[PDB]
C-alpha cells in the first residue's frame, strides 16, 4: 500500500522523492478515508458502461471489439478483482 | 558531550547499582560501535499517517501531520537536526461507533480481571 | 445463591432502560422527574441488600431522560432546548452501556458485584446531570436564568475532575447557541425568538432594555457591554468575544 | 510468469481503446493498487491531480 | 464451607450479608449463625469484618456526599478522591466472586492474603477520614502530609496520591489570583478568606485578612501572607510550591 | 515549545518515549549520532534495563 | 506477606493427601532461621528502648554476629538497610540542601549558626562517632562499601 | 420467542407484521402471543411502535 501509491506519484510526475511530497499528502488523505469499495461488487455493470460509451460516440466496431478483449482478460485466470481495474480505465476515458 | 549523554540514557530507563551503571554504559557504546562497523522523514511520516487513516483514526492522522508541519515553519529553540529526531521517533513507532468504543473499554477490563486471577492460580 | 443473583441482573436491565422489571417494580411517586424503584420480596436478605444499592443509579438516569423528552414533546425553541440536546448526547453513551452489559449476559457470568464496578463510572456522569435537572424544575428557569445556573455549577464542581467535565460541556454547548443569537443581532438589528432565547425585550436609541431575569452566564457587568452595543447600532477569553462586539460599537458611533 | 505477461497485453489493449493515456508502467501500478482492494472512485480522483 | 466465604464477601461489598452484623447497633464482626461451627469459626468471623468496618465507613461518607457545594468546597473534593480509591477496592472483590461461582479456589485462606495487602490500605484510609473534620484545606492538607511523615511505603503511596487532589482546588484558585485577581469561590477553596474587609478607595490597605488557623503544609504562615500581597498588587512538591509563589511575588514586582 | 510539540508526536506514534529520555536523545542527534544507531542503542539498553527490574 | 503466602501454599496442598508432620518441616527450615533472628532482633529493640540511630547500631551488631549462616546474614543485611532508607534521607537534605526539620527528632541534629549540631546517644550512629562529626559540619555552613564517602564528598563542597 | 424479534423489523417497514396491528391516535399495536416470554419486552416493543407510527406520517 504505502510504496505502491508513492510509485504512482513518481512515475506520473516524473520526479523522485522530496519533490512529490505535498502531492503524496493529498493522495494519502483521499485514498485512506475511503479505502474499501463503496459500490456492490459486479463485473457486468462496469462492462456495459464501457460498451455504451463506445455506442454513444458511434464507435460500434470497437464496442464489439471490446467484447472480445474482456473475454481474453477473464480467460487467462490471473487477475481477480477485475471490476475495479475496468472501472478505473472507464472513469479515465 | 556524547560519552556522558549515553550514561544519562541508560540511567533514565531505571528511573550492585554502581556496577550495573557501568555494565549498561558498556552496552550503549558497544551497540554504537557494531552498528557503525556494518527516504526523507517527511515521507516516512506520511506513510505512518496512511496506516492510521484506514483504521479509522482520521482525526489523529490530521493531528500528526499538522504538528509535523508546525515544527518545520519554526526553527527549534533547542532543536537543530529536527529531521533526525522525528526520524528516531519513526523508527520506534509502534449507532455502532459508540458501541465499538464501549465494547473495547469493557473487553479490556474483562481481560485484566482474568490475568490477576490466573496469576494467583499460578502461585498455587 | 449464585443462581438467584443471575435473574436479578436481567431484571435490573429493564429497570435501567426505564421499563417495567420482573421483580423490581417502577413507581412514580414524586413530582420531580426521578422515579422510585422498589424491589419486591426475596427469601434471602443477601441478595435484598445487593439489589438495593444499584437502584440509586436508574434514579439519576430517569431525571435527565424524562426532562429532555418533556422538552421535545411539548415544543420549546430556547437555550434550555440546546441544554437538553447537550444532555442527550451523554444519554447516548449510557444506553449503549446497557446493551454491552446485556451482551455479556447472553454469555452470562455477571454477578451483581462484578457488574457494579462498571455501573460506578456512569453513576458519576448521571448524578451530576440529575442535580442540574432537579434545580431547574424548582426554578422554572428559562433563558439566561439557565445559563447562569450552569455557571454556578462550573465553580462548585472543580475539584472533582470528572464532574467538571460534564458541567463545563453543558455551559459551553448552551452558550454556543446564545452567543450566536448575539452575532445575528450584530448583523440584523431585529431578532425573532420563538419564546426567549436572548435577554433583549422587543416591542431615540431604541428601547432594547432587558428583563432582570435573563442575562449571559456571566454577571451583569459584561451584559452592560451588549446593551450599549444596540443603543449605538441605532446610531476569561469567552468574555472577549463580547469585547469584539463593543469595539465594533465604538467604530459604528 | 508467461500468463502474467499475456494478461498485461490484454489490459494495454483495453487502455488504447479508451484513450486513458496510461503507459505500460502507469497501468501496471494501477493494477497493483486495484488488486489490493482500493475503491476505484478515490483512485481516479488522485490520478487526475497527479497529471496536473 | 463455601457458603460462609459467600457470607463475608458481601460485608466487603457493602454492609451485612446473609446474617446481620449487629448485636446492638455496632459493626463488630457478625452473629454466630453459620451452618458449620468449628473453633476455626472464631477466626473466619474475625476475618470477615477485619476491613468491613473500614469499607462501610468510607462508603457511607460517599453516600452522604451529594452537595452542589456548601460549607467548604475542599471537603467534598477530598471525598471524591476517597470515591476513586473505593472504586479500585471493588475490582479486588470482583476477582473473589469470579473464583467463588461458576462463570482449592473455594478455600478461604487464599483470599485472606489477597485482602491482606488491602488490609494496610483501606484501614489507614479509614484513619484519614477520622483525622479530617476540616472543610477548608490546611486541615486536610495537613492530614495527608502527616502520613507521609510515618514509615511504610504501602500507605506512603496512598496518601501521596491524595495530596495532589486536595491541592487541586487550592492551586486552581491560586494561579488565577496571581494573574488577574479572579475570584470564583463563595465557600472558600483557599486558605485566605475572600473580601472580609470590603473594597473602598485604598491607601493600599488589606482587603483580605488571613486565617492562620488552617494553613497547608505545602505553604506556611509567612508564605500565606506573601500571596495576599500578590493579590493586592494585581488590584505534590512540598517545599517547591513555596519557591514559585515567590517568583510570582518577583514577577508582579518587576 | 518544540519539545512539547515533539512529546505529543512521540505519543501519537505510540513509540515508547517519555519527556526525560527524549531530551537526552535530542542532544545526541545534534552531536551527530545517526538516527539508525541511536534507535539501536535505545532498544538494547531497555531490554537489559527491564531484565534488571524484574529481578528487583 | 511472604510468610503468609507460604501458608497458602500449604493449604492448597492440604486439600490433597501429601502433607503430614515432617513433610512441612522442610518449608519450616529456611523460615525458622529467618524468623528466630528477626525475633531475637525485636526483643532487644522494643524492650531495650531504641529509636533513631540506636536501632541501626543494634542491627549493625547483628551483621557482625550473623556472618555464620548465609541465610542469617541475608536477613539483617536486608533489615539494616530497610531501617536506614528513611533515616539517610533526612541527613541527606542536611548535607546537600541545608534544610532540616525534626518533628519526632528523626536525626541527631536538633535545631535550637547558634542552632545546635547535637550528636545524641539515644540515636547513637551505626558509623564511628568521628565520621558523624563530618555529617554535622557539612550542615554547619549550609544552615542558617562507601556510605561514609557520601558524607566526605558533601563535606569538601561545603568547605 | 425469536419470531417476535423478527416481527418488529416489519413495524418499521410498514405498520403490520405477523400479527394484525393497527394505528389509532398513536402507535402500532402489539400482540406478543402466548405467554412464554417476559411481561416486559412488550414495553421495549412499544418504544419501537412510535417509529412505525412515525414512518407512516
Automatic annotation (TrEMBL), chain B:
Q: Which family does it belong to?
A: Belongs to the TUBGCP family.
Give the protein's function: Component of the gamma-tubulin ring complex (gTuRC) which mediates microtubule nucleation. The gTuRC regulates the minus-end nucleation of alpha-beta tubulin heterodimers that grow into microtubule protafilaments, a critical step in centrosome duplication and spindle formation.
Where does this one sit in the cell?
A: Cytoplasm, Cytoskeleton, Microtubule organizing center, Centrosome
- Range within the parent protein: 3 to 184 of 1698
- Subunit structure of this chain's protein: Component of the gamma-tubulin ring complex (gTuRC) consisting of TUBGCP2, TUBGCP3, TUBGCP4, TUBGCP5 and TUBGCP6 and gamma-tubulin TUBG1 or TUBG2. TUBGCP2, TUBGCP3, TUBGCP4, TUBGCP5 and TUBGCP6 assemble in a 5:5:2:1:1 stoichiometry; each is associated with a gamma-tubulin, thereby arranging 14 gamma-tubulins in a helical manner. Gamma-tubulin at the first position is blocked by TUBGCP3 at the last position, allowing 13 protafilaments to grow into a microtubule.
**Domain of life where this protein originates:** Eukaryota
Q: What is this protein called?
A: Gamma-tubulin complex component 6
UniProtKB/TrEMBL annotation, chain C:
Q: What is this protein called?
A: Gamma-tubulin complex component
- What's this chain's function? Component of the gamma-tubulin ring complex (gTuRC) which mediates microtubule nucleation. The gTuRC regulates the minus-end nucleation of alpha-beta tubulin heterodimers that grow into microtubule protafilaments, a critical step in centrosome duplication and spindle formation. Plays a role in neuronal migration.
The family this protein is said to belong to = Belongs to the TUBGCP family.
Show where the Gamma tubulin complex component protein N-terminal domain sits: 9-253
Name of encoding gene: tubgcp2.L
Q: Where in the cell is it found?
A: Cytoplasm, Cytoskeleton, Microtubule organizing center, Centrosome
- Show which stretch of the intact protein is covered: 209 to 498 of 896
Assembly, in brief, is:
Component of the gamma-tubulin ring complex (gTuRC) consisting of TUBGCP2, TUBGCP3, TUBGCP4, TUBGCP5 and TUBGCP6 and gamma-tubulin TUBG1 or TUBG2. TUBGCP2, TUBGCP3, TUBGCP4, TUBGCP5 and TUBGCP6 assemble in a 5:5:2:1:1 stoichiometry; each is associated with a gamma-tubulin, thereby arranging 14 gamma-tubulins in a helical manner. Gamma-tubulin at the first position is blocked by TUBGCP3 at the last position, allowing 13 protafilaments to grow into a microtubule.
Q: Which residues form a coiled coil?
A: none
